[PDB]
Ligand binder design. Structure first.
Ligand code: HEM
Length: 94
């Protein structure tokens, strides 16, 4: 479509509520906020893994190929490469 944007966890972390839930997967962030009541998984399920790494939590159920393409539609932006290796969780400075 056009030059994508480099989204960061520090930011996404903000939108970690129903109002706006994000989820990183395959070095790529996607928006499913509107796909909350559309996901055959539930809502609290997405939230539980909002603004965080849900790769394993996603691949766990081996998302159907159609899902791998669905995301494309519900795309938002790309997650910084020097961010994914941050695994925002185990503190930053401490
Ligand atoms: C845009 C994002 C997402 C899309 C498009 C998506 C799509 C799907 C689809 C299509 C299914 C399988 C249907 C089939 O194979 O026929 C599924 C299942 C599942 N998804 Fe997602 N998913 C998304 C995000 C997530 C997230 C963030 C989580 C976890 C937090 C999650 C957890 C699950 C689980 C656990 C299942 C199995 C359903 C069950 O609960 O029985 N999904 N997803």
């Amino acid at each position: 479509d056009k030059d994508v944007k480099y989204y960061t966890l520090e930011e996404i972390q903000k939108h970690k509520d129903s109002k706006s839930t994000w989820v990183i997967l395959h070095h790529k962030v996607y928006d499913l906020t509107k796909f909350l009541e559309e996901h055959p998984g539930g809502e609290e399920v997405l939230r539980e893994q909002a603004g965080g790494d849900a790769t394993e939590n996603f691949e766990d159920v081996g998302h159907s190929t159609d899902a791998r393409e669905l995301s494309k539609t519900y795309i938002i932006g790309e997650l910084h490469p020097d961010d994914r290796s941050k695994i925002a969780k185990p503190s930053e400075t401490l």
